[PDB]
Amino acid sequence: IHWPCRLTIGSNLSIRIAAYKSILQERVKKTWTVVDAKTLKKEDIQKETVYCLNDDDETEVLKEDIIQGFRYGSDIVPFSKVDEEQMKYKSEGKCFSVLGFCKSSQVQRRFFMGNQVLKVFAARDDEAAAVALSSLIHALDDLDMVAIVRYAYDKRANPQVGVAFPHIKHNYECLVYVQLPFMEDLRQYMFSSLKNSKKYAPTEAQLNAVDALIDSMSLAKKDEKTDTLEDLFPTTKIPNPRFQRLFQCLLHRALHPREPLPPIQQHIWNMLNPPAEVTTKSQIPLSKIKTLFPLIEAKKKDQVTAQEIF
């Protein structure tokens, strides 16, 4: 979708732009709706509640005789969102306020929040914007820069920070975007040192056999002398198996519901297996590892009780 705006640096720089939500997980398109079981319509679908009062004597109380209190230490402070709307945080929205520029060596994938990518490009009637954009992405690539941009989508939206970088190539100079965290978006547990664990150090024979596994491992192979790494199982071309499973199962009900819906089908699993040569060549390293490393297990698993009488 096209989303226009104007990025700002200071109080003097303003460039009309256009943003596009690009990397977005597709979810259920027909969210399942509820009907009656003996008529199969919304003739019996309604609601009955007014959120009766929690008391020693539960009194049927109106939805307007009641306060949205708030957990405050060891109590529930009375409050209504009418109070928020008059002294809540007031976000501006539709803004790309660039706060600063840091070293590209300072930002890490560990410091990425969000789920998606936003492509942003200059708006039309602005060719100077386009030439300046290409030149500035050249400059940023030269100088190893990453921008801090406090961004707010609209009056509805809060400050949503993030950074977008140009995928400089012969193909599109798109802006791969990632949301950035705050300190409330991070925690830091304690993790003891492990390479120093005398009780749990890997023996050199086990290490060499693990290297044998890794060599027998091959998913992103390298056979092209043109410096091309070839992967034989990409993830960007396999959509949610929810969709395929739902379609395959639905087929029966759409045609004849009485008998059970089709299983997930061996072909679906065939799209989820790597080259068997890799597993075969790893088996000898796999066997030597499973002989060189001792394991113990405890079982707390579940069993199906819808069970065939034969």
């Binding site: 309604q46 009955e48 049927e60």
Partner: peptide
């Protein structure tokens, strides 16, 4: 009106 559900009532 009360007790007897709003829609039900």
């Amino acid at each position: 009106r009360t007790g007897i559900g709003r829609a039900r009532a």
